[PDB]
Amino acid sequence: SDVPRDLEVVAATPTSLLISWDAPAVTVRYYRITYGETGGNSPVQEFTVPGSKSTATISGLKPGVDYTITVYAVTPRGDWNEGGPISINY
Amino acid sequence: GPNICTTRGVSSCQQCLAVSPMCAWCSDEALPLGSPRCDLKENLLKDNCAPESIEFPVSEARVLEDRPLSDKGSGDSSQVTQVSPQRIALRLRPDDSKNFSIQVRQVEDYPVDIYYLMDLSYSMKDDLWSIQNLGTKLATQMRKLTSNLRIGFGAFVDKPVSPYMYISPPEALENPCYDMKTTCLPMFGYKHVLTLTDQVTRFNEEVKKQSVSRNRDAPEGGFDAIMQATVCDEKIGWRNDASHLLVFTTDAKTHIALDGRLAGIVQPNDGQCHVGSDNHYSASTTMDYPSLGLMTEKLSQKNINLIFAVTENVVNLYQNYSELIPGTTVGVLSMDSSNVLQLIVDAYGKIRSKVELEVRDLPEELSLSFNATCLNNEVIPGLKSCMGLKIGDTVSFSIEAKVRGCPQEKEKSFTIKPVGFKDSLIVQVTFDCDCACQAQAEPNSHRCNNGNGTFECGVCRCGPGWLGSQCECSEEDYRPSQQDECSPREGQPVCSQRGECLCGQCVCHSSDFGKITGKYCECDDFSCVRYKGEMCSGHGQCSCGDCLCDSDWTGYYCNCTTRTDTCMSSNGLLCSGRGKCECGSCVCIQPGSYGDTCEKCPTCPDACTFKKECVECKKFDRGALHDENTCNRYCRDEIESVKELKDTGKDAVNCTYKNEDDCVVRFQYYEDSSGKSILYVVEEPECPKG
Amino acid sequence: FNLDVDSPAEYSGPEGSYFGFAVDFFVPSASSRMFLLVGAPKANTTQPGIVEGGQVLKCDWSSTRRCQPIEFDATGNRDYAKDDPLEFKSHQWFGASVRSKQDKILACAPLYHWRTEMKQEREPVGTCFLQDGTKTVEYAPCRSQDIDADGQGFCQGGFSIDFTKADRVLLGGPGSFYWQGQLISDQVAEIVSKYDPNVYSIKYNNQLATRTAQAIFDDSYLGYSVAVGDFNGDGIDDFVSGVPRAARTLGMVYIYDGKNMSSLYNFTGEQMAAYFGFSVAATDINGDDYADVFIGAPLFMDRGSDGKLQEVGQVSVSLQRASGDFQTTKLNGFEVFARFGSAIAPLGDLDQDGFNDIAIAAPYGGEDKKGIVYIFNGRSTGLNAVPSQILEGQWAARSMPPSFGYSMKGATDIDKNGYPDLIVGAFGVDRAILYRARPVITVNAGLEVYPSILNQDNKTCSLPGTALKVSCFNVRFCLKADGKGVLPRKLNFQVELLLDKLKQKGAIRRALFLYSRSPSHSKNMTISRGGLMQCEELIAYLRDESEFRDKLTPITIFMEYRLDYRTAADTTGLQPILNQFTPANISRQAHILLDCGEDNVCKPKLEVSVDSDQKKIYIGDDNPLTLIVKAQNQGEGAYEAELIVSIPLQADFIGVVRNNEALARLSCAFKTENQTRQVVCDLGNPMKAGTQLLAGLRFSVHQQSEMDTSVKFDLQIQSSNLFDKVSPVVSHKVDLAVLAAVEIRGVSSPDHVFLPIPNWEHKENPETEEDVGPVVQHIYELRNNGPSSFSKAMLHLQWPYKYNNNTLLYILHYDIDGPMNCTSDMEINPLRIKIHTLGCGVAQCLKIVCQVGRLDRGKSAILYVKSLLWTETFMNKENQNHSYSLKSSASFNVIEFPYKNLPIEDITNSTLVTTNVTWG
Ligand SMILES: *[C@@H]1O[C@H](CO)[C@@H](O[C@@H]2O[C@H](CO)[C@@H](O[C@@H]3O[C@H](CO[C@@H]4O[C@H](CO)[C@@H](O[C@H]5O[C@H](CO)[C@@H](O)[C@H](O)[C@@H]5O)[C@H](O)[C@@H]4O)[C@@H](O)[C@H](O[C@H]4O[C@H](CO)[C@@H](O)[C@H](O)[C@@H]4O)[C@@H]3O)[C@H](O)[C@H]2NC(C)=O)[C@H](O)[C@H]1NC(C)=O
Ligand SMILES: *[C@@H]1O[C@H](CO)[C@@H](O[C@@H]2O[C@H](CO)[C@@H](O[C@@H]3O[C@H](CO)[C@@H](O)[C@H](O)[C@@H]3O)[C@H](O)[C@H]2NC(C)=O)[C@H](O)[C@H]1NC(C)=O
Ligand SMILES: *[C@@H]1O[C@H](CO)[C@@H](O[C@@H]2O[C@H](CO)[C@@H](O)[C@H](O)[C@H]2NC(C)=O)[C@H](O)[C@H]1NC(C)=O
Ligand SMILES: *[C@@H]1O[C@H](CO)[C@@H](O[C@@H]2O[C@H](CO)[C@@H](O)[C@H](O)[C@H]2NC(C)=O)[C@H](O)[C@H]1NC(C)=O
Ligand SMILES: *[C@@H]1O[C@H](CO)[C@@H](O[C@@H]2O[C@H](CO)[C@@H](O)[C@H](O)[C@H]2NC(C)=O)[C@H](O)[C@H]1NC(C)=O
Ligand SMILES: *[C@@H]1O[C@H](CO)[C@@H](O[C@@H]2O[C@H](CO)[C@@H](O)[C@H](O)[C@H]2NC(C)=O)[C@H](O)[C@H]1NC(C)=O
Ligand SMILES: *[C@@H]1O[C@H](CO)[C@@H](O[C@@H]2O[C@H](CO)[C@@H](O)[C@H](O)[C@H]2NC(C)=O)[C@H](O)[C@H]1NC(C)=O
Ligand SMILES: *[C@@H]1O[C@H](CO)[C@@H](O)[C@H](O)[C@H]1NC(C)=O
Ligand SMILES: *[C@@H]1O[C@H](CO)[C@@H](O)[C@H](O)[C@H]1NC(C)=O
Ligand SMILES: *[C@@H]1O[C@H](CO)[C@@H](O)[C@H](O)[C@H]1NC(C)=O
Ligand SMILES: *[C@@H]1O[C@H](CO)[C@@H](O)[C@H](O)[C@H]1NC(C)=O
Ligand SMILES: *[C@@H]1O[C@H](CO)[C@@H](O)[C@H](O)[C@H]1NC(C)=O
Ligand SMILES: *[C@@H]1O[C@H](CO)[C@@H](O)[C@H](O)[C@H]1NC(C)=O
Ligand SMILES: [Mn+2]
Ligand SMILES: [Mn+2]
Ligand SMILES: [Mn+2]
Ligand SMILES: [Mn+2]
Ligand SMILES: [Mn+2]
Ligand SMILES: [Mn+2]
Ligand SMILES: [Mn+2]
Ligand SMILES: [Mn+2]
């Protein structure tokens, strides 16, 4: 219940991704996004987005080689507690 | 004549000097008994005693060195000396005082070394990215204000011990972020990475080599980092001749002292440096967090300026924290640390905007008074600081030092210094109580031969019961009714009866509930006045009719403080400029104003009347506030001539007035939350046509 | 003040084991011997594989000074599986909390970790062990199915523990619910009856516990300390816990109901990071049978003489009244970095004076930063702020600070002396010290002289050496002393007698004892406890007549007495102590007969006369009140004449007048001894014939009850003569007057509206506040500056609504600030618009009338009036280019005062506010 249920791809023009999740019921501190290389040695990488923004952007991928994208929700408690890794393969 | 010293004062040479600073003693090499014993040197001198036998020490405020205030403090010959004078020798006789002055200057180009203390908890991963090239970006901005710049980096997360540290599972010790399916490095208490150096590319090299860790509880201990970065000046390399700025960047709350009891840490923090050759705070797991008092003490001693760079959600917490640590400034830090490059320059302006003197090693036997001269020639008594200054200005302070009595403390010295500055004013206090004639000491039997007496400085005080120059004064039927001197006024009672006259010396009996002194038994203790039922309010010694107020107390009742801190408002002005400050309490002068700092005045004129006085002297260079040359001191508002009186009225006031040119001027007054107040001015006002 | 620091009981455990981190008494019902319980965390035990498990040692008062560890667990780590421990128990700090009721001992391990039985984790849940006789159970209320940081895994239960009056424990844990904190209360029987060694998470019936709250309350550390006591009328001890990090680290103290765990009261520290709530305690400090709160803020920073901040720490003292909210005072520390409020320990009634006493300790202050414990005695008026005894640490600082006073416990009488004693722990040097209280003896002594007047020609007694009649008199010194507790039957007093104490080393003696022929004498006395005021006699032969020339100087008989250390108890060196504030000496004065007439007795006629320079005294403020006293003795000499000035409760006497010569100085002292306040002035001893003295006494009155018409001053002269010893009591009063400086002020915001209005168009029926015109704001303030206050007043506002059937200033709304209600005779804002000189005379008038309540000195009443300039009426046809001055006036009338039965007779004034509109 601490996980957004959204983020199917939007605006697939550039060598990037524009994802958009929708309003988890609990208060959100930050959002964490990971990506990259489904079946390979996995050059995974991330970046931080404030909890008020519902969109993000990624960079540095091959010409549409079907990456894997995950998004985490960060609880406003402790230093950094999170959970609910909703994922999509695009 | 008989003013204070001739009568009620003649006891001995050392006691004559302790009565009044205007008294004097003599040793006239003969015995003209009369009354040339202890007297003013305008009357005792006329008593024909001056073969340099006059003992009249004068209080001296001699300066031992005063280097001139330099213009630019970078580069050339030596000794920037932003404070003048430096060493003066104070010499005071009992119950006397002298006064001196001191000028301090914010030098044009003063070296600055800034140390970046950064939180490395997981909420700062975004911040560590955008700070990659902000080392050289900060170089170009600080180059304008200072040619000699240094930068260093330091890291902290929290104490690496439970319950703060991720202690389990064992699969997550080298990776405290395990459930996150990513990799972070093990958490650390305080990590010093780059020492202070003048290579701004070296800063960017150690950045992006650092990585972000993870913690468990929201309060992150950075006071351990602040304490270490202050007292490890050898390790991190503080320039002893440069402006020290320590920027503290975090987005969450902080641990305070006594929080370490949960982790089983009960040893108090010491001001000692514990960062070793491994560049890690070793005592992090064994020593508690430092308190605000200990942080304030060592921050002042090392002349370090602490800058709080925190987010808006927690900025109010550090606002109140900084109020408990004077001299520190807080600034809004963006979530991604994109504002640090500008926030540093803004903070260094505020730090160099104020000058406040601090006293160290002050002997409590003497108190210091302060009249401050911050503006052109307008003096502000009771204040030891100046606010609203730009780099290059010079302010003055006049200081008076008064002693209660005089000790034999072996001429200990003390320091007067502005906060955060290296240059200081050292004052060597000396006390000359005793007379120079005591060295001979003439022990017992010169002119008081038998029935062993004494001889000192030309007088004899012989034994327990015998009295006077001539002696034996004995305890038997020896019966003089002395005359006319045991009492003044020619008809008063005998010796103002507490003890009676025996041979004239008035040995005062009834010695209880305090001591009875004085030549006519005139003096005593406990004879002073009360304020709330406590004599001299407990803030002053009682000297025979009067209270000798302790340090930082004045008045007949000694119930009036010299403190101006309770008069200080939130904007900086004492009593908001609407009233005087007397005994730590404001007395408002502007009609309709009241409150502790006269902050409440609902019937005062609106801001339109007040702020238009700035737009006249600043934009039109005329009107009031201009001929006093106080235009660009009271007017710190940003003013820009614009057109159409724009729409954004989030919280603003439109003001219209008619100038002496009989034209209508329109302007505005806007402010960002807890920030600055800007003034828009509509250009091309409306004037009569034709 | 009665603690013995000479021969205390020293205890020492193994070094490095924090011996003394927590101390308490042990008073089992099964025996008469009482023991010491000293916790010792970080102590290596015989538990297999457990490093520094901690101990709780039982030290005895049997004088062998030996401490024996108490077996609580004695077992290693239980296993969740093979090579998978369920608990870890190493460095668990078992012993950091020790508290004991009659026969039961409760010890806890706040750093005990747990495996959580679901996933592999090490969560500091904390555990406790309750032992009653041979049986030992485990109480771990925070070890439950609520696992992670959002639950109770980091709770560290047992961080602070306590017992209630009837078998119920109060447990605190600071780490529950993301370090919000938690209080858990359980019945002692439930803890023992429901214990199951094969169940790790036990649910207890009748468990009172605080629940999780909003995330803003995180990192508050509730349960950091605990105290018990009754704060309502239920009779059951309620819960008191400190929350040092609550309210943005201001510090808070919560008081929960000990019955249904509901909030009762609160406290909040005034300074951030001061750790308000590090230490708490509850005791009746004023004998009211109502518990009073004590809160410690060791890191509180106060202001010194300079005004800079210094960390001395302060302790919050809150007296509970039977009505409701407490009366809270503050008590600052003494030394910097001393942490004055680190430990607050009640110790029964130490001096047995009828009021309980408390001890506050600064573990890091004093000489060499060894540690200081301050003792504070209670009084009828509350807690005496002046410490009566200081206890200094006696041990070095080898590795860490000795922390002498970091933990204390009192309110138990370990010996039979009848006085409660105190335990002080160090844990820095791994030591604990026991200070025993000494019995208090209140002693009173009388001194009498037969007779007080001596006649030199009346020689009766014969000198022992040679037979010559000498004038003589008698002196009797009676001595009685008693006390409570265990103190010996007979006490050894050593008393010294001094004749003519006034004259001293260089002077005549004028009086010696008969047989000893000496001015001084000593006597060894021995009295009994109850009554029996024993006396002795040696008689005072006067010196040879006409041999000293000094008459009129009273021969002062002075008796001072001490107590020999001979008599003590079987306690091996615990001697009693005299009362704290009692005179150790008493004086009597005899006088030589001189100028007492042919009757040989001095009969004076004393007279007091006082005129009124001051006439009126204004209610509400202090003011100078000077009285001129005319004391004259028309008669023979008056021995020991004194001026008695009986003052009211509002007097607050201060000093005497010096600046005048017509009135000379006087020796006056303020004193209140027996049920009355008064000022005593010396009028000369003896006050000879004539002697017309003038003097003045200054006063500053703080009036009372607001209904008193006058203030009472009764004056008379007293003396030691047998006949006509006093003067007629003369009374002087000055009337209370009412004076209230009330002013009315007004201002227009803005005071100018230039025309035309930029970007303005005319709507025939607008609701904009923009289509109408600019906002003109009139602010009226009615302020009472005078010392006296008034209860009711009337305010009338005259507003120029219209002029020639069209609006001038359309009033949108008006607001009130202060005790005032207002009503407009016309409906404000009738159009429902939402966000030369024209006065209320020649123009249309709209009135606003207001009623004013009680206004004191520092309070005022403000009326904000937000109006709109109706631009349509101006600028159109009849007012095209002309300057108009919109004038509004306001008047006030004060009609009532709270000082009925006193002259008032009027208060009234007025003012006006103008808003000028012009062209160009
Ligand atoms: C001494 O100081 C103590 C420390 O502050 C005081 O204790 C505090 O008293 C407050 C007043 O009673 C109390 O505030 C109330 O909190 C409860 C908490 O229950 C909640 O239940 C919900 C579901 O679990 C959740 O709250 C929802 O709504 C809030 C907004 O209120 C959201 O922020 C949440 O996300 C969630 O959606 C919470 O999880 C929580 O468990 C509230 O129910 C109360 O609501 C009341 O007000 C609303 C209007 O705002 C009414 O409609 C409603 O009917 C209630 O009347 C209050 O917010 C604090 O929790 C409590 N704190 C602690 C630590 O005890 C103590 O009162 C004081 N005593 C004295 C004598 O001064
Ligand atoms: C220290 O103690 C002295 C003596 O107790 C105080 O002197 C008193 O000060 C007041 C003003 O604060 C004097 O004025 C008197 O008060 C009314 C108030 O409305 C004023 O209007 C009158 O002029 C009236 O004289 C007062 O004369 C003076 N002496 C007294 C009361 O005997 C002094 O204020 C104290 N200072 C502090 C800082 O507490
Ligand atoms: C600071 O300025 C004040 C100004 O009054 C000085 O006050 C002195 O004390 C008397 C008492 O009222 C004043 O009337 C005089 O102006 C001053 N006496 C002199 C100059 O002899 C005060 O001395 C000044 N302090 C310093 C350190 O300069
Ligand atoms: C101050 O300026 C004018 C007053 O004449 C106000 O004007 C508004 O903002 C712009 C600039 O004039 C224009 O769109 C309109 O004149 C006004 N806004 C609207 C929506 O009509 C301005 O609001 C005033 N601001 C304050 C704070 O008083
Ligand atoms: C309890 O015993 C342990 C045994 O390990 C002691 O811990 C060792 O102490 C020595 C010296 O103090 C250190 O050199 C060792 O490194 C410690 N062991 C470990 C594993 O770190 C401990 O000091 C003892 N404590 C007491 C109070 O006796
Ligand atoms: C004369 O002196 C005698 C002795 O000093 C006085 O008699 C004493 O009277 C007091 C009480 O006033 C007794 O306590 C003493 O015991 C008496 N002493 C005796 C009787 O030797 C006597 O009062 C004095 N005055 C006279 C006789 O007029
Ligand atoms: C202002 O109006 C209120 C409301 O009638 C008056 O009544 C006060 O407040 C409540 C009603 O809400 C009453 O029960 C109280 O008895 C009243 N309080 C006091 C102090 O009288 C109130 O009196 C009016 N105040 C004035 C100054 O006229
Ligand atoms: C003291 O007065 C002024 C400052 O108050 C100072 O400049 C001056 O030198 C001193 N005067 C004397 C006579 O010491
Ligand atoms: C900071 O202090 C001010 C007044 O001292 C207070 O109004 C404000 O609430 C405080 N802020 C916080 C976050 O405590
Ligand atoms: C809790 O306290 C007492 C029960 O003894 C009662 O007066 C009060 O109403 C109770 N309140 C709640 C909410 O349980
Ligand atoms: C006698 O007692 C007083 C207090 O009543 C005390 O001040 C004094 O020191 C004592 N000793 C004397 C007067 O010798
Ligand atoms: C308005 O005009 C009147 C004319 O007498 C004047 O008294 C008043 O001061 C003026 N108000 C201003 C200038 O605010
Ligand atoms: C009204 O106040 C004025 C000063 O504003 C004063 O001169 C006048 O005496 C006062 N009149 C009354 C009746 O209070
Ligand atoms: Mn963090
Ligand atoms: Mn961030
Ligand atoms: Mn943390
Ligand atoms: Mn109760
Ligand atoms: Mn009480
Ligand atoms: Mn007591
Ligand atoms: Mn005892
Ligand atoms: Mn007579």
PDB file of C-alpha atoms in Angstrom, chain B residues 461-535:
ATOM      1  CA  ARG B 461      51.311  52.488  65.356  1.00  0.00           C
ATOM      2  CA  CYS B 462      52.535  50.932  68.591  1.00  0.00           C
ATOM      3  CA  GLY B 463      51.267  47.616  69.875  1.00  0.00           C
ATOM      4  CA  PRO B 464      47.949  46.190  71.096  1.00  0.00           C
ATOM      5  CA  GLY B 465      46.437  48.978  73.192  1.00  0.00           C
ATOM      6  CA  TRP B 466      48.977  51.764  72.828  1.00  0.00           C
ATOM      7  CA  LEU B 467      48.142  54.274  70.114  1.00  0.00           C
ATOM      8  CA  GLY B 468      49.200  57.482  68.398  1.00  0.00           C
ATOM      9  CA  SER B 469      52.569  58.797  67.283  1.00  0.00           C
ATOM     10  CA  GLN B 470      53.560  59.079  70.912  1.00  0.00           C
ATOM     11  CA  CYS B 471      52.397  56.013  72.747  1.00  0.00           C
ATOM     12  CA  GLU B 472      51.335  53.860  75.734  1.00  0.00           C
ATOM     13  CA  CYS B 473      47.662  55.041  75.409  1.00  0.00           C
ATOM     14  CA  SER B 474      47.136  52.730  78.326  1.00  0.00           C
ATOM     15  CA  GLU B 475      44.145  50.900  79.797  1.00  0.00           C
ATOM     16  CA  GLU B 476      43.743  52.612  83.170  1.00  0.00           C
ATOM     17  CA  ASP B 477      42.550  55.842  84.825  1.00  0.00           C
ATOM     18  CA  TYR B 478      44.514  57.868  82.244  1.00  0.00           C
ATOM     19  CA  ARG B 479      41.745  60.411  81.622  1.00  0.00           C
ATOM     20  CA  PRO B 480      41.747  62.972  78.828  1.00  0.00           C
ATOM     21  CA  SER B 481      38.472  64.386  77.527  1.00  0.00           C
ATOM     22  CA  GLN B 482      40.192  64.593  74.232  1.00  0.00           C
ATOM     23  CA  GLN B 483      38.592  67.602  72.772  1.00  0.00           C
ATOM     24  CA  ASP B 484      36.590  68.949  69.855  1.00  0.00           C
ATOM     25  CA  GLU B 485      38.113  66.355  67.491  1.00  0.00           C
ATOM     26  CA  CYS B 486      36.593  63.203  68.906  1.00  0.00           C
ATOM     27  CA  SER B 487      33.491  65.046  67.621  1.00  0.00           C
ATOM     28  CA  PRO B 488      33.067  67.793  65.008  1.00  0.00           C
ATOM     29  CA  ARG B 489      30.521  70.642  65.163  1.00  0.00           C
ATOM     30  CA  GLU B 490      31.879  71.656  68.612  1.00  0.00           C
ATOM     31  CA  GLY B 491      29.247  70.064  70.825  1.00  0.00           C
ATOM     32  CA  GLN B 492      28.423  66.708  69.194  1.00  0.00           C
ATOM     33  CA  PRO B 493      28.465  63.395  71.158  1.00  0.00           C
ATOM     34  CA  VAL B 494      31.724  61.600  71.994  1.00  0.00           C
ATOM     35  CA  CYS B 495      33.050  59.687  68.952  1.00  0.00           C
ATOM     36  CA  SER B 496      29.569  59.100  67.441  1.00  0.00           C
ATOM     37  CA  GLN B 497      29.106  56.520  70.087  1.00  0.00           C
ATOM     38  CA  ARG B 498      29.822  52.926  69.203  1.00  0.00           C
ATOM     39  CA  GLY B 499      33.144  52.901  71.004  1.00  0.00           C
ATOM     40  CA  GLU B 500      34.291  55.748  73.219  1.00  0.00           C
ATOM     41  CA  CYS B 501      37.387  57.961  73.056  1.00  0.00           C
ATOM     42  CA  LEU B 502      40.438  56.411  74.736  1.00  0.00           C
ATOM     43  CA  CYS B 503      43.470  58.721  74.304  1.00  0.00           C
ATOM     44  CA  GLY B 504      41.770  60.003  71.125  1.00  0.00           C
ATOM     45  CA  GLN B 505      42.209  57.093  68.715  1.00  0.00           C
ATOM     46  CA  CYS B 506      38.550  56.021  69.183  1.00  0.00           C
ATOM     47  CA  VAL B 507      38.987  52.273  69.593  1.00  0.00           C
ATOM     48  CA  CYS B 508      35.511  51.293  68.412  1.00  0.00           C
ATOM     49  CA  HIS B 509      33.798  48.814  70.734  1.00  0.00           C
ATOM     50  CA  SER B 510      30.497  46.982  70.089  1.00  0.00           C
ATOM     51  CA  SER B 511      32.098  44.953  67.284  1.00  0.00           C
ATOM     52  CA  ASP B 512      29.188  42.716  66.289  1.00  0.00           C
ATOM     53  CA  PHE B 513      26.697  42.374  63.427  1.00  0.00           C
ATOM     54  CA  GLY B 514      29.453  43.829  61.273  1.00  0.00           C
ATOM     55  CA  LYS B 515      32.651  45.763  61.811  1.00  0.00           C
ATOM     56  CA  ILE B 516      32.896  49.394  62.924  1.00  0.00           C
ATOM     57  CA  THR B 517      35.669  51.429  61.303  1.00  0.00           C
ATOM     58  CA  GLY B 518      36.559  55.073  60.763  1.00  0.00           C
ATOM     59  CA  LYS B 519      38.689  57.446  62.808  1.00  0.00           C
ATOM     60  CA  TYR B 520      35.653  58.746  64.729  1.00  0.00           C
ATOM     61  CA  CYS B 521      34.003  55.302  64.518  1.00  0.00           C
ATOM     62  CA  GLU B 522      32.118  56.981  61.678  1.00  0.00           C
ATOM     63  CA  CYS B 523      32.356  54.094  59.214  1.00  0.00           C
ATOM     64  CA  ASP B 524      30.844  50.610  59.371  1.00  0.00           C
ATOM     65  CA  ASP B 525      29.405  47.863  57.224  1.00  0.00           C
ATOM     66  CA  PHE B 526      25.695  46.943  56.882  1.00  0.00           C
ATOM     67  CA  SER B 527      24.753  50.660  56.818  1.00  0.00           C
ATOM     68  CA  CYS B 528      23.718  50.746  53.149  1.00  0.00           C
ATOM     69  CA  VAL B 529      20.241  50.787  51.619  1.00  0.00           C
ATOM     70  CA  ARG B 530      17.878  48.006  50.530  1.00  0.00           C
ATOM     71  CA  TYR B 531      15.870  47.431  47.350  1.00  0.00           C
ATOM     72  CA  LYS B 532      13.768  44.274  47.866  1.00  0.00           C
ATOM     73  CA  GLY B 533      14.887  43.675  51.453  1.00  0.00           C
ATOM     74  CA  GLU B 534      18.402  42.663  50.366  1.00  0.00           C
ATOM     75  CA  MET B 535      21.216  45.117  51.056  1.00  0.00           C
TER      76      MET B 535
END
